[PDB]
Amino acid sequence: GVQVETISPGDGRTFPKRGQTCVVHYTGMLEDGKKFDSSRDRNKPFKFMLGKQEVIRGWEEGVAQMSVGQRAKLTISPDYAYGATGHPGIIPPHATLVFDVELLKLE
Amino acid sequence: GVQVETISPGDGRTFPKRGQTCVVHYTGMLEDGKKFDSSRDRNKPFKFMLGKQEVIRGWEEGVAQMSVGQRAKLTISPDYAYGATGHPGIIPPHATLVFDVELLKLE
Ligand SMILES: CC[C@@H]1/C=C(\C)[C@@H](O)[C@H](C)C[C@H](OC)[C@H]2O[C@@](O)(C(=O)C(=O)N3CCCC[C@H]3C(=O)O[C@H](/C(C)=C/[C@@H]3CC[C@@H](O)[C@H](OC)C3)[C@H](C)[C@@H](O)CC1=O)[C@H](C)C[C@@H]2OC
Ligand SMILES: CC[C@@H]1/C=C(\C)[C@@H](O)[C@H](C)C[C@H](OC)[C@H]2O[C@@](O)(C(=O)C(=O)N3CCCC[C@H]3C(=O)O[C@H](/C(C)=C/[C@@H]3CC[C@@H](O)[C@H](OC)C3)[C@H](C)[C@@H](O)CC1=O)[C@H](C)C[C@@H]2OC
């Protein structure tokens, strides 16, 4: 599944609802901290909606537990990410992923 | 993992080696037989190589057990396919997939 560990607290009152646009900043890493991608590097947040298979399941379940302004680490098991296949030439088979995510706003 | 059930036998001697081009015909279905895709419908075989993350793991492990001319049903568990996410708007979360595959030739 997914484990959420909070780095900085959110407002504790505004949680994402299916159908809302989530705006975030993320950094993706392997369990040893090796970085594979970051929206921060591109200077552009990533936007997605819950409930439309727009993101891997670990995000669908992890982001729903965050409130606006929260910064958290999401640890995602392989089945909730790229499973036994991985992602071609970036993520190996059976990898648990770690994402540092910040929920900037809901729109 | 993956289960291979043979419909028509292969030559029993030519098995795919990593680095070879596999040429196949396939039909993808859910466990109840509902078809989601088929190369047969397009009149064009599908070509891929083992060992390059070009296909879901259930195929990487299942096709390697087939010999040229064999026709088999591959039953693939979710982690060896699209896991808890599925494939956007085609395959639901946690689905076991069934592929009817025919190994036409190796090149
Ligand atoms: C068509 C292009 C479209 C690309 C964009 C919108 C780009 O803007 C995004 C910034 C994507 C990033 O591009 C730089 C890049 O992000 C990674 O680096 C990454 O950090 C990651 O894991 N992320 C991205 C941040 C959210 C979680 C996760 C994801 O859910 O990503 C999604 C993902 C790949 C889902 C698979 C879909 C097929 C399912 O079957 C499978 O189910 C197992 C899951 C991704 C958002 C797709 O929905 C949409 C796209 O692919 C991926 C390793 C590879 C990916 O590039 C492709
Ligand atoms: C860039 C376009 C490129 C498209 C082609 C070469 C097309 O010619 C192929 C005929 C693909 C088919 O297009 C009509 C179509 O096939 C499905 O319908 C399907 O039956 C399927 O499941 N197949 C296809 C036959 C081999 C097994 C499996 C697969 O391995 O497919 C691979 C797959 C999606 C892997 C994911 C990669 C990201 C990983 O992270 C993730 O790991 C979980 C696994 C597919 C071959 C990709 O490598 C390459 C592409 O996507 C998919 C449901 C969706 C897919 O369209 C995308």
From Swiss-Prot, chains A, B:
For this UniProt record, the keywords arranged alphabetically read as follows:
Acetylation, Cytoplasm, Isomerase, Membrane, Rotamase, Sarcoplasmic reticulum
Compartment(s) of residence: Cytoplasm, Cytosol; Sarcoplasmic reticulum membrane
EC number of this enzyme: 5.2.1.8
- Give me the segments passing through the membrane: none
Q: Where is it mostly found?
A: cytoplasm
Does the record's keyword annotation contain Glycoprotein? no
Domain annotation PPIase FKBP-type: ranges: 19-107
Biological process (GO) annotations held by this record are: 'de novo' protein folding; amyloid fibril formation; heart morphogenesis; heart trabecula formation; negative regulation of activin receptor signaling pathway; negative regulation of transforming growth factor beta receptor signaling pathway; positive regulation of canonical NF-kappaB signal transduction; protein folding
* Isomerase is among the record's keywords: yes
Annotated family: Belongs to the FKBP-type PPIase family. FKBP1 subfamily.
Q: What is this protein called?
A: Peptidyl-prolyl cis-trans isomerase FKBP1A
What organism is recorded for this protein? Homo sapiens (Human)
